[PDB]
Symmetry: D2
Subunit: 115 residues, 4 copies
């Protein structure tokens, strides 16, 4: 299947696994998703991190819900960093998932508990 | 794992699994993807099929490649149909994958051999 | 602003062509760029996407019907051409907005009879 | 065509705000719609996306830096606000194009010093 192709652990050299960091003041959550924020992943017209989708899967919940989708659309100058910040309100607890795409290295995922 | 939330089997009384139909003439490939072409899926502002992505995983290939992404953005009038046609050139043989999203029923997938 | 950057012509065909067929309320729309004279399709230069809007008569604003992204430009080569399907009994104007990674925004329109 | 449909008045806040921070070539850009005066945010009425363009002073075309979709409008409630990051040593103009599902396209601009 296609889900089989979704990786969640890097291989040395390149960095793909999305990093999910959040901040929460009551109901409003602040989420930062990124790829190669320290050890940058290549970013050129031929090889780059095209986009990152953010899902939220509430506890006692059947389906993950797509919160947002960000596209890094230029890879020369300007050079768009595969890094973004999303804003959403919710009163539920659950886990956040990040799905990222490298144009030549497929899909990648990660997660974090929204406490 | 978000990967494990992806479904490939419908539950009685709602189509979600995307159907993939292709027509190849030489190096030219025409792909039609859709959800509930015969037995429609609900299409309202509260419930609908938001988008479908088409990946091509060539044989002797390590990663699936995203060919295209189409978004059905309105759900009143006009009512955007979760059905679309893509066009691409390739000389490789391989497997085609469709990833679709229902805003309340999550991610779904299917595949077809690109002979 | 941004609207002023939106072109209608050529430079290399960039103008998105809109073609539709109607069967009652169902409109089948094909949008494309350089279907005769192909536009460059390479990682460095290509058509990235097209948005299809419908501005119904007796309606103040245009409504986004669908958006398509042509995401690979090597092999496979995603041709900047797509077909949408949407139901509507109304009549009006169809707008198509396409984007070239190095030549900006291009628009076009056709009457939906 | 589409050009004429793009507003920048005030519908109820629709006009997308652009704010940025600069550290060398690295530009932190935050785009939003109605952070002061919240725009409706329901399945029927909401801001769906915002596109951020950069038009270099010595460039003839505006380049799409990034795009963001706010995909859920119940709970969670994706707020139409995002932060982008891009590198560029050049200066010029920044454009934001936001879309409301029932009020169309809106635009704004800010000089990138
Ligand atoms: Fe990579
Ligand atoms: Fe559903
Ligand atoms: Fe071009
Ligand atoms: Fe509005």
């Amino acid at each position: 299947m296609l889900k089989e192709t979704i990786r969640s652990g890097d291989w040395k050299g390149e960095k793909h696994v999305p990093v999910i960091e959040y901040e929460r003041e009551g109901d409003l959550v602040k989420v930062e998703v990124s790829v190669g924020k320290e050890i940058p992943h290549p970013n050129t017209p031929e090889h780059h991190i095209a986009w990152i989708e953010l899902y939220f899967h509430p506890e006692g919940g059947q389906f993950p819900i797509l919160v947002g989708r960000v596209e890094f659309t230029n890879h020369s100058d300007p050079l768009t960093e595969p890094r973004a910040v999303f804003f959403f309100k919710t009163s539920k607890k659950g886990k956040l998932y990040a799905l990222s795409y490298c144009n030549i290295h497929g899909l990648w995922e990660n997660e974090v508990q929204l406490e």
